[model samples]
Target: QFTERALTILTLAQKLASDHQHPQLQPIHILAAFIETPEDGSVPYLQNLIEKGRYDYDLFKKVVNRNLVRIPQQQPAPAEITPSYALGKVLQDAAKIQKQQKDSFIAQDHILFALFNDSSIQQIFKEAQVDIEAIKQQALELRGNTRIDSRGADTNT
Candidate 1:
């Protein structure tokens, strides 16, 4: 199954592209993002991600044409966070948490929150679930309860 976080990122990216008033950013950019992922994980260029989490070649032309943006030439090419890497980190965390929680099904909700906890791609993460104020308050509460020391090296002395 595509990680929920990844899906959220995809949706947010599309929204941002649309908001930018660039038609190319929608289907065009979204496809580019998909292409960036590993072949095994990525839905094929010609196909779409069916409900079963499998590539459906039959729907490929339909969705791509509908969603992708066509550019005569990409001047500098856009910079986007690759989905595979993000998904891998989420998968690793999911496995670890699954082991901890002893849950067989790896729910996407878990992946969603993990993405929220991830600080690497703050902009995209926040864009996906734009309840930043609530997230901030929740984060403060969460950090207050969790134990971690990232103060400094001098603190070790």
Candidate 2:
């Protein structure tokens, strides 16, 4: 029964991701992201975005790498940082913040905050012409006031 239910969920998620053209929401990345994220349920709302493929795999990979590299005990030496590692760090930090705040949804501000706080990741945002503060302000305004719409034009896969 559990396997059947899981299969059904996977089917539904695939349909949604395909419908939204969410490249990052690919099955492999979704599973990886879910694995990397803490199971605090602080952002079930992110399931929709995850289903919608609303993230960058390259960034996530970069962020994860950065976090892993920072652990002195895990390696003989520091590893080269990647863009995806930076993104993963941002996502992970946001998830931590959401859990701390006891929020059910991981707000965009959390993401922006993570990005802005990371020097390496912030450089990527700068290159992309995205203002992290502006995004946070908009997210703040959208919090509990109205629905916020996030549309990503994903050219970098």
Candidate 3:
């Protein structure tokens, strides 16, 4: 099951690819959308990291957008687009993280962790001079809760 935020990221990814006339969806597209999400979403974790001087969000976005530009456009830019092979693998990895976390739904946090679970995207971030490990820890701490399925009520157990 996917959370609303996760679905929103997918929607944004599609729009990014379509608007830019990119050939296919890439992990960078998803990642960029995640970074653009509302403050209550996972974007804040990244914002805090950037605020702490972890890396330059502008440059990172610029590089990512440049890469998207290189993906080549389709005739009339296909009305529908699919995730690239690499992005598929990233989603699979995210699913694994979701299972490992025992979360009731595949939250944005799982997707964020999955982005770094593999070395390909990790290498991209590293090349951008980002401190991936520290950012991961910051996201984990921001999540705080062990689970995200509980309703609006306090639990003492």
Candidate 4:
């Protein structure tokens, strides 16, 4: 239950993890992909977070990237990869947020909410001195009254 853009980003995240030989697909991979894509709402939203004086983008990126670099890799890489326990928890939280927002699909913002909900990620933000709560509030408010119900129109084709 994700939009096409969200799916593409997640697919790329998985590919990035596999290419790097990371044993588990972490939020850092998805986040880095989001940062790399200017067109995605993810980056814009993050910039908004920065603009709102919640945190410094460059500093946040530096911390995240540093942690990403430390993830152990598999030699020769692997054809497939599984989501880490942390990533899975994020997805679970995102699903709950999806229903709370009454959206038929999970969007990028939901992913961010899930990311922030994770303690490991939160620890990174904490160490970086970022206000995680402020960012989360802004993100939720930014989502506003938008709802996406892209589940096909027909129940039976």
Candidate 5:
């Protein structure tokens, strides 16, 4: 369903929420991890656009309200950290885009396109000061002309 890096980014997103004790893993969590996941490493596909666009953790923090974001940690912390509706939609939409494009797997930039599918997350990223289309442009460029023979392979196993 997802490529190696995409899966790792989701896991890191979960960690970001769990470590901070946030009840819901939102797109912001996904966004944060996507940008920060192993930088100066092989995730260069989106790195330049992100850096040129100047998206940062602090950038996400500034516009987004703290009172709205950080609620009291869930007691016990025993239950699974639930993904917010926003994140769920992103995942669903991203998978669709991955198949639509006939990519080998759900790549990281596919998730970026899906984020724009949400009103709230799209607005939030717009507020954070970045060109949405340019990001998509980079995704397409990074993806290149890698159309599959039949369907994109599911490497989750």
Candidate 6:
């Protein structure tokens, strides 16, 4: 099962695509929902990573929104919208990350790492001059059990 924030971004992604009348939910929607997640008193997973990468979070989000609009919303929204192929793979990869780490549940950090493997978002980071390595390292440390506070925050303390 996904941690609270992890599950939220996925659900939010669905809602975003549905509300926009987009027929398929893609990684773009997931990425957007991720940066927008406000985890009570804590930072959302991707927001922490993006700013740590030295990129303005709002700028990165603007670029994602630009691409999201390019997808073209459907008229008379359908009752069902499904995950696009790459989005499905991203979730599967996230599960693999959870397994490899032997974690009790799927963390947003796992999903971020999985998104790293997917390549789509990397270009966006590159455009903003964000260092992927640092982003990844921070993500791991946050999800890691060796440290205490970030993990505590990740679990909603």
Best by lDDT: 6
Point out where model 1 deviates above 4 Å. 1-83, 125-157
- Candidate 4 error regions (>4 Å): 39-43, 150-157
For model 6, what is the C-alpha lDDT against the true structure? 0.74
Write the residue-wise lDDT of candidate 5 on 44-116 in tens digits. Answer: 4445555645566356545544433454677677588888877888999998988888676787767878877
lDDT of each: 0.39, 0.41, 0.71, 0.71, 0.67, 0.74
Q: Model 3: per-residue lDDT, tens digit, 1-80? A: 77776777778888888887787888877877765646453444456655555578877766666666666778766666
- Higher-TM-score candidate of 3 and 6: 6
**What lDDT does model 5 reach?**
0.67
Clashes of each: 6, 12, 0, 0, 0, 0
Q: What lDDT tens digits, residue by residue, belong to model 2 across residues 1-157?
A: 1122223333444443444343323222232233233233344323333223444445544544444334333232224222245446655776776556455445443544454577754554454344556545544444443322222211011
The residue pairs that clash in candidate 3, if any, are none
Give the TM-score ranking, best first: 6, 4, 3, 5, 2, 1
Order of candidate numbers by lDDT, starting with the best: 6, 4, 3, 5, 2, 1
List residue ranges in candidate 3 displaced over 4 A: 37-45, 150-157
Clashing residue pairs in candidate 4 are none
lDDT of 3 at 48: 65
Q: What is the lDDT of residue 21 in candidate 5?
A: 81
Candidate achieving the largest TM-score: 6
Cα lDDT of candidate 1 equals 0.39
Which stretches of candidate 2 lie above 4 Å from their native place? 1-88, 105-109, 145-157
Candidate 6 lDDT, tens digit per residue, 64-107?
77777778988767668977798889999998987787776777
lDDT of 4 by residue, 1-157 (tens): 7876567668878877876789779888877655554443334546576557657788877887777777888865555687878888888898898788778888777777788877787887787778888888776666566565763210110
TM-score of each: 0.30, 0.33, 0.80, 0.82, 0.75, 0.84
